[PDB]
Design a protein around this nucleic acid. Structure first.
Length: 1269
RNA sequence: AAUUUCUACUGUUGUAGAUGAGAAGUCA
DNA sequence: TGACTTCTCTAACGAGCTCG
DNA sequence: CGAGCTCGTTAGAGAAGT
């Protein structure tokens, strides 16, 4: 229905804060007097260091509930029992009831969890916090380590020792709740909530199965020699770790020897099966790497793996030697510096100057022995398994001349070696399996010559020989130490202050691969990287050839994969950085309480000077500048003091302040009602107090017991002033039905008067801290539209915004301000030559008066004071917004349009606003998109941004900016989809998208289509700056998008980039003619072919029955009318010419083909059984209809109609009409929405099917375009 | 060649489209 | 390789607690 | 030494899409 105004105001969630505040008035000169803001955004060694330094009372006791932790041994048997009730009974009885039993086990350990002595007053306000006798518990436990010597002091970071503990006692001392922010999310994430994101997934979630891994699953391991793992063999001299203290079922009191079952009992978890030692199974199950004497006591490694390898039992692979996993919630840079950002990565290989590998050899023995082993067929057919993904499959391109030819052995080597009836198992078994089996690998690599000539074979160990040549990069890499050593040579100071600019290009090219040459060796070694077997049993041979000798470097080469930013994200970074302390107005109330009674203590009250906001928090000691007795006398007209009182939610604070005991007689409550709150009698999920008896939501008792609360609300002692005129008592059904005015009035606002010297001589003496917070986009000379963070942040705290409900203030400020880095300089002063770098700026010069003074904002200490002005803040959510959108916008289909903002190669996008009959509306490409006062050009402006080698067009700039430009370049396409989407009521489905920056803002233009607030509409119209039409749903975690996610829909996300715009000819039936008789069978599969008596060339004829091409059958006759553009290498010849009509006689004369004879010469073509005579009949078909050519290469996007029309129209993108696509890039989405432009059947026929048919079938999207007749 | 920020900047002491802030774990 | 986390956006009320 | 005292806790809704 044109529902950009129909779906108005769905449900609202907050923005963030737009002010950057300059010390307006003399307040900037005032705080420089008392020195407050110098150590406010500069307390930043305390409030963000003790909150990490509070592990030693917040993880040591967060661990120490294990040392007194104890589950029942019956449950310890029931862990093997009821867990085995699920683990051996795959069913919800012992599984889900056992999950209820695990939930009971979550109550099992959990009852002892909330009852610690010091662990019941640590996550509260006396923990480090102050009581009269309540000292720092971490102050105690650290002070107990103060004489004691806990090594967390002087251990992790930023704490030299407990001598810093005065600041560990001060950084929460002044910041009372302001060393105390961290005690909210980090003291409930360990709650009883049944997520593994808690202790319940790492304390026992890795401990319930962990003891079952050694007992219920490790029980069958003792079939050979449990004493073969020598208990006396391990008890010779290195049994210091075996002095176990308590037994689980035993409970012995001595540091004595725990046996492999003596510790390993299923209820024997006195030193195992818990969270505090969850990997320490490997403390036995590995052994003892005795580095104090330089030894390695092979225990569970030397026995369970060593004798387990010494036996070599493949059926005995039910139990090996291993270690447990890691617990949860444990207590266990730059590439832009000029002295440290490279030389600190220079030790990553620089340690190996006399280094060694983990194969018990030196650095020369590491590559020559650990990397020189499995290349000779050292991996078995059933013993070695290379990583079977495309991350190793690209080595097929690197070493076999085709990653798509090397992967053919999934039909041949292990596949056709196994399945001669080629089965959907290849999508998951080995092809979709994460390991490439050496039976298909060693033998199928040798078996590569099955189809082609004899040169088309390979060596199955030959890729290991291809892996074998890896070593020689490091010899010149030692010589490559001067690569960064040119620009790094001035490394006297640690803080060298020159990183990436072109004045020091000796390091910039030289560090670009000087150790970064090994970065593709990981991308080449990707068939040796481990794969986390989540849902993968992975029964294969343990190919530990890269795991024992190569295992010193397979994990030892980890400095590359985690280093994708570390040494190469400070060149691609920025030159003047934007990080500084967030400072607080003299309390945890530092901007906290911004509401109509907090003014004494909430610390922050506004000010609007009759032109715009500039508002100050009162001074530190004399905190009664706006004190209400002195507020009465000093009334006047120079400042602003707003009167804005608020209220929290209508169940969390309504019967929590108007039912409290000090006013319980002061309100005089009722006992016939008081039975309801004594049990949660109104509570649909309620309860009484501690000692109340839980009952249901007795709404009859509720509707009056809540209705009596409105009568108690009638006695508003302080909250009477709101006039929260609620509805009838029969109406408000739930507690939220009575909570349906808890925020339906409870935020009321007004403004006051204040003397010009009242604020002034108050401020001149120092009453306020005078912050005058005002920016570019709302200054005096500003004349355009106002910005985003300045077009509400003084346009909702304003006279229209208090009339209806638009968006209040919220809490959450900070007075953030901090240092500056770039020492300033005039970049090009006004009255100079400022040449205009934009494209169509005809004024080719520029001389200002007031300069374009380069890099203004990052020059010196600004402010920052941002307050989460929670817009849309008088409405609740939209459950099934898509069910709203598909409900509502699936109710006005006739006015419905469909923009289909697809993707492209050489254009930017192609906003092909497709229409109801299927014609394009405005296929408006997007390469250079700007305004009426300029076009800001990108489509070659980015192409101008790139096109520079060194290092091969991959350096930090075109990496950074040539990506960051698209990071700019998305924005206007928002507004283009913004303007266009309700420009005709169209659903703009940038279709199914799951790239790295064309999906990486494919929901960065989908979290800005949730309400249009656009800088020039009618400022109360449904569509303008206050009362929006709600477009999307929210956006959290990128894979969640899925199908019908608001506006960013899903269309057929493949097989729509070489489409056929007239019929969609099946351009997959295209042979190679390697099998000549196979191509002769393809010639036999050639249905019927005659020379161009009307077609003007040769031809080819074959339907879907002729191939295995089961879409349909028909003599469509893709013909020989069009021309041909020819690809090539640069050098060969990247552009080439071709003729579709040509090659018709050129084959008929190469053979004896009567090309003018006019008969089934495909039989002669199949009779033409030459090696080239057959093979050349395919390459002419190889360009038989593939009409999308480079219009020169590229230079154009010449499409060609591979099959003609009913009037013979083979429509061609070189000269296409308006109602067809455009080119190679800008016409590349024009079918990709055209596939999604038929999905409105499921929109316009949406039924009670709760999951709509948003899954796409390419035969349907084939059949839909083919069904255009 | 200037912005709370960021990219594009002349649209000249700012124009233009845009921006959720901070928390705070992590798997890549 | 960037997501996947997930919650912080509140003022009155009884505390403690030095006052009055 | 009741003045109430300034801060720290304290209070508990139903929400909702392979």
């Amino acid at each position: 229905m044109s529902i950009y105004q129909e779906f108005v105001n769905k449900y609202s969630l907050s923005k963030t804060l737009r002010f950057e505040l300059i010390p307006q008035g003399k307040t900037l000169e005032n705080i420089k007097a008392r020195g407050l803001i110098l150590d406010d955004e500069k307390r930043a060694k305390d409030y963000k260091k003790a909150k990490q330094i509070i592990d030693k009372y917040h993880q040591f006791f967060i661990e120490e509930i294990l040392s007194s932790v104890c589950i029942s041994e019956d449950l310890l048997q029931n862990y093997s029992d009821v867990y085995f009730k699920l683990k051996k009974s795959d069913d919800d009885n012992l599984q889900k009831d056992f999950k209820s039993a695990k939930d009971t086990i979550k109550k099992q350990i959990s009852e002892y969890i909330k009852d610690s002595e010091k662990f019941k007053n640590l996550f509260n306000q006396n923990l480090i916090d102050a009581k009269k006798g309540q000292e720092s518990d971490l102050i105690l436990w650290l002070k107990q380590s103060k004489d004691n010597g806990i090594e967390l002091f002087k251990a992790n970071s930023d704490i030299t020792d407990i001598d810093e503990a005065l600041e560990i006692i001060k950084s929460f001392k002044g910041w009372t709740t302001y060393f105390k922010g961290f005690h909210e999310n980090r003291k409930n994430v360990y709650s009883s909530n049944d997520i593994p994101t808690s202790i319940i997934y790492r304390i026992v979630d890795d401990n319930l199965p962990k003891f079952l891994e050694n007992k219920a699953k490790y029980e069958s391991l003792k079939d050979k020699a449990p004493e073969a793992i020598n208990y006396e063999q391990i008890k010779k001299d290195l049994a210091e770790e075996l002095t176990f203290d308590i037994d689980y079922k035993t409970s012995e009191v001595n540091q004595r020897v725990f046996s492999l079952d003596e510790v390993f009992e299923i209820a024997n978890f006195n030193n195992y099966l818990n969270q505090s030692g969850i990997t320490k199974f490997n403390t036995i199950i590995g052994g003892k790497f005795v580095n104090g004497e330089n030894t390695k006591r092979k225990g569970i490694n030397e026995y369970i793996n060593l004798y387990s390898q010494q036996i070599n039992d493949k059926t005995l692979k039910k139990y090996k030697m291993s270690v447990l996993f890691k617990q949860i919630l444990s207590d266990t840079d730059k590439l832009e510096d000029d002295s440290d950002v490279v030389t600190t990565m220079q030790s990553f290989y620089e340690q190996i100057a006399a280094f060694k590998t983990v194969e018990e050899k030196s650095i020369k023995e590491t590559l020559s022995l650990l990397f020189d082993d499995l290349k000779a067929q050292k991996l078995d057919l059933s013993k070695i398994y290379f990583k079977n993904d495309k991350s190793l499959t690209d080595l097929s391109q690197q070493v076999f001349d085709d990653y798509s030819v090397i992967g053919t052995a999934v039909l041949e080597y292990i596949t056709q070696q196994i399945a001669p009836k080629n089965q959907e198992l290849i999508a998951k078994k080995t092809e979709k399996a994460k390991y490439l089996s050496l039976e298909t690998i060693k033998l199928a690599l040798e078996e590569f010559n099955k189809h082609r000539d004899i040169d088309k074979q390979c060596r199955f160990e030959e890729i290991l020989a291809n892996f074998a040549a890896i070593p020689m990069i490091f010899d010149e890499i030692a010589q490559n130490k001067d690569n960064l050593a040119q620009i790094s040579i001035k490394y006297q100071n640690q803080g060298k202050k020159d990183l990436l600019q072109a004045s020091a290009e000796d390091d910039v090219k030289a560090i670009k691969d000087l150790l970064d040459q090994t970065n593709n060796l990981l991308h080449k070694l990707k068939i040796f990287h481990i794969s986390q077997s989540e849902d993968k049993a992975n029964i294969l041979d343990k190919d530990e050839h890269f795991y024992l000798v190569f295992e010193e470097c397979y994990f030892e080469l980890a400095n590359i994969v985690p280093l994708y930013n570390k040494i190469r994200n400070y060149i691609t970074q920025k030159p003047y950085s934007d990080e500084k302390f967030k400072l607080n107005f003299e309390n945890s109330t530092l901007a906290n309480g911004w509401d109509k009674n907090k003014e004494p203590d909430n610390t922050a009250i506004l000010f609007i000077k009759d032109d715009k906001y500039y508002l100050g928090v009162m001074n530190k000691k004399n905190n009664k500048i706006f004190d209400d007795k002195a507020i009465k006398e000093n009334k006047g007209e120079g400042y602003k003091k707003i009167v804005y009182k608020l209220l929290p939610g209508a169940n969390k604070m309504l019967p929590k302040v108007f039912f409290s005991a000090k006013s319980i007689k002061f309100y005089n409550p009722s006992e016939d009602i008081l039975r309801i709150r004594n049990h949660s009698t109104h509570t649909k999920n309620g309860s009484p107090q501690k000692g109340y008896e839980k009952f249901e939501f007795n709404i009859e008792d509720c509707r009056k017991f809540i209705d009596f609360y409105k009568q108690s609300i009638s006695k508003h002692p302080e909250w009477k002033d709101f006039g929260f005129r609620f509805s009838d008592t029969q109406r408000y059904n739930s507690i939220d039905e009575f909570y349906r005015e808890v925020e339906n009035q409870g935020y009321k606002l007004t403004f006051e008067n204040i003397s010009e010297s009242y604020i002034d001589s108050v401020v001149n003496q120092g009453k306020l801290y005078l912050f005058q917070i005002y920016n570019k986009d709302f200054s005096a000379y500003s004349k355009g539209r106002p910005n985003l963070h300045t077009l509400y942040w003084k346009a909702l705290f304003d006279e229209r915004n208090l009339q209806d409900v638009v968006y209040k203030l919220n809490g959450e400020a900070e007075l953030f301000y901090r240092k500056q880095s770039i020492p300033k300089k005039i970049t090009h002063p006004a009255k100079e030559a400022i040449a205009n770098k934009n494209k169509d700026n005809p004024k080719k010069e520029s001389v200002f008066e007031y300069d374009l003074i380069k890099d203004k904002r990052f020059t010196e200490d600004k402010f920052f004071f941002h307050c989460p002005i929670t817009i849309n803040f008088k409405s609740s959510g939209a459950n099934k917004f898509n069910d709203e959108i598909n409900l509502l916008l699936k109710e006005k289909a006739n006015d419905v349009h469909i923009l289909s903002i697809d993707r492209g190669e050489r254009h930017l996008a192609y906003y092909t606003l497709v229409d109801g009959k299927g014609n394009i509306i405005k296929q408006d490409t997007f390469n250079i998109i700007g305004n009426d006062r300029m076009k800001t050009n990108y489509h070659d402006k980015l192409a101008a941004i790139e096109k520079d080698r060194d290092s091969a067009r991959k350096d930090w700039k075109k990496i950074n900016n040539i990506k960051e430009m698209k990071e700019g370049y998305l924005s206007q396409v928002v507004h283009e989809i913004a303007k266009l989407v309700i420009e005709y009521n169209a659903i703009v489905v940038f279709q199914d998208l799951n790239k790295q920056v064309y999906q990486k803002l494919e929901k960065m233009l989908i979290e800005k289509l949730n309400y249009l607030v656009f800088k020039d509409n009618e400022f109360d119209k449904t569509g303008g700056v206050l009362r929006a039409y709600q477009l999307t749903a929210p956006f959290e975690t990128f894979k969640k998008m899925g199908k019908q996610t608001g506006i960013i829909y899903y269309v057929p996300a493949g097989f729509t980039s070489k489409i056929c715009p007239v019929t969609g000819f099946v351009n997959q039936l295209y042979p190679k003619y390697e099998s000549v008789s196979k191509s002769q069978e393809f010639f036999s599969k050639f249905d019927k072919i005659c020379y161009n008596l009307d077609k003007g060339y040769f031809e080819f004829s074959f339907d879907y029955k002729n191939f295995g091409d089961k879409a349909a059958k028909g003599k469509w006759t893709i013909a020989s009318f069009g021309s041909r553009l020819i690809n090539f290498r640069n050098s060969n010849w990247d552009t080439r010419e071709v003729y579709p009509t040509k090659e018709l006689e050129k084959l008929l004369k190469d053979y004896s083909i009567e090309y003018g004879h006019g008969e089934c010469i495909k039989a002669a073509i199949c009779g033409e059984s030459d090696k080239k005579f057959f093979a050349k009949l395919t390459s002419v078909l190889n360009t038989i209809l593939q009409m999308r050519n480079s219009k020169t290469g590229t230079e154009l996007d010449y499409l060609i109609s591979p099959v003609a029309d009913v009037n013979g129209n083979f429509f061609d993108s070189r000269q296409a009409p308006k109602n067809m696509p455009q080119d190679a890039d800008a016409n590349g989405a024009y079918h990709i929405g055209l596939k999604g432009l038929m999905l409105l059947g499921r929109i316009k026929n949406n039924q009670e099917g709760k999951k709509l048919n948003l899954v796409i079938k390419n035969e349907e999207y084939f059949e839909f375009v083919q069904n255009r007749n």
